[PDB]
Each structure stands twice: as C-alpha cells, then as structure tokens.
C-alpha cells in the first residue's frame, strides 16, 4: 500500500511554478544592507542588556512572531504594473 498524492497534477504543478517566473537578484544588496544595519544601529541595544527579563523575553517572542522568512518569499508587487 502507498498513499495517494492529494490534488490534481496540473493544479499542483501550477502551484509549484507560481511566483518564480522572475530573474533572481544578486545577494550583494542583502549583504551590504545587513552590514550597514549592524554597523550603524546595533549600538542601540547596549543598554538593553540591563533591562528586566520579562521585557527581553517578550521582545524576543515579538521579533520571532513578526519575522518574515527569506526563503520562498514572494510579493504581489513583483507582477503588477502600478502601485
């Protein structure tokens, strides 16, 4: 016995193709912007190490809850001709 793949093959393969019909950007922009963000604004966290631990833990959970994943990322703005 083997389980059946759910769905239709044409519809599943169109789902697999979606949002990838675009040339991928080079990674130099992401890396340069990350380095600029760290070298310019990471000193804002110097006093944060002394803040109460409930605040630090809730802030860490908030950063995890609002994080957007870089892999498999897509925007509807990539395929529209006006804002």
């Amino acid at each position: 016995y083997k389980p059946e793949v759910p769905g239709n093959t044409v519809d599943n393969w169109t789902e697999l193709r979606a949002s990838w019909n675009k040339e991928r950007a080079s990674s130099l922009g992401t890396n340069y912007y990350l380095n600029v963000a760290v070298m310019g604004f990471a000193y804002w966290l110097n006093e944060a190490y002394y803040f109460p631990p409930r605040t630090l833990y809730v802030g860490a959970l908030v950063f995890f809850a609002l994080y957007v994943r870089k892999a498999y990322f897509s925007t509807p703005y990539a395929f529209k001709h006006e804002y």
Partner: protein, 157 residues
C-alpha cells in the same frame, strides 16, 4: 501459459521526439519504467543540459528542464506542493529555471516513461547558471561536447 509471445525489448520500447535548444529534432528511445532524464542521458546529450535534483537525499539524480504539450500534462507524476518534494521542485524552479519558465515547464525525472508517452514530443528548456560544488557547475553557455553519460559518478561532494 501457452504458445503466447516471447518477451521482446520492442514490446517495452517508448519513442519520444526531443527538440534541443538549437531546434534540432532527435529520436529518443527508452524503456517502460525508465524516467525521461535517464533516457535523455543515455541518448548522449551534453552535460550542460542536466542539473541536480535539489531535494534532500536525491542530489545524485540528474534532471532536465523539459517543455511538455498540454495532452501529456496529466501524465507527469503528482507532487504535493506542501510536502518536502514540493519544496524541492519549488527550489529548482526558483534557482535553476527563473524567467525561462513557461506553462509547459516540468522536470524530466518526474516523467516515468510508459505506453502513454509513445509519440510524445518534448523540448529542452533553457536554464540559468548554477553551482553545486567546485566539481559540478554550469557557467551559462552550452558550449561543450562532453556527454553526461560519460561521467563515471554523480558526486554530491
């Protein structure tokens, strides 16, 4: 059991017409149960046409970008887009094909040759430059006479 026919290779033969990226038509013979990428490798196509299947535990499988007509769309095997195999196909579409993608774009290891593929015409699609490691890459130009079949091993490392 009686006087019925001895099994021949011709009973299991599948013929596919393949148009390469120069527009030259080729006659490709395969066997039932063999994938399409294997028949393309054994025909003698160059190594610049092939690339690793980018899943976990399957990078030793070579794969190619093929264009499949609408009649044979339903004979490509089904992949769940939520599973890990679906994410493998999504990674391949994201990184290897990019803006060469069409509505007929598939991958040749997901086509298992049977009697329903007999007479099907496919075309080889273009791909973007890619790298797996230092001993397996593609600079972007299909200028090489080295066949994929002549490689003794497919190396993940």
């Amino acid at each position: 059991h009686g006087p019925a026919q001895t099994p021949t290779v011709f009973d299991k033969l599948v013929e596919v017409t393949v148009v390469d990226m120069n527009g030259i038509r080729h006659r490709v013979r395969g066997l039932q149960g063999q994938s399409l990428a294997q028949a393309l490798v054994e025909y003698g196509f160059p190594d610049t046409y092939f690339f690793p299947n980018m899943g976990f535990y399957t990078q030793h499988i070579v794969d190619a970008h093929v264009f499949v007509p609408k009649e044979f769309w339903g004979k490509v095997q089904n992949v769940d887009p939520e599973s890990d195999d679906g994410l493998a196909v999504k990674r391949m579409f994201r990184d290897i094909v990019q803006d060469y993608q069409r509505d007929t774009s598939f991958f040749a290891s997901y086509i298992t040759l049977g009697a329903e593929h007999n007479g099907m015409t496919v075309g080889i699609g273009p791909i973007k430059p890619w790298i797996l490691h230092s001993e397996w890459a593609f600079a972007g130009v299909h200028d090489s006479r080295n066949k994929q079949f002549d490689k003794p091993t497919v190396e993940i490392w």
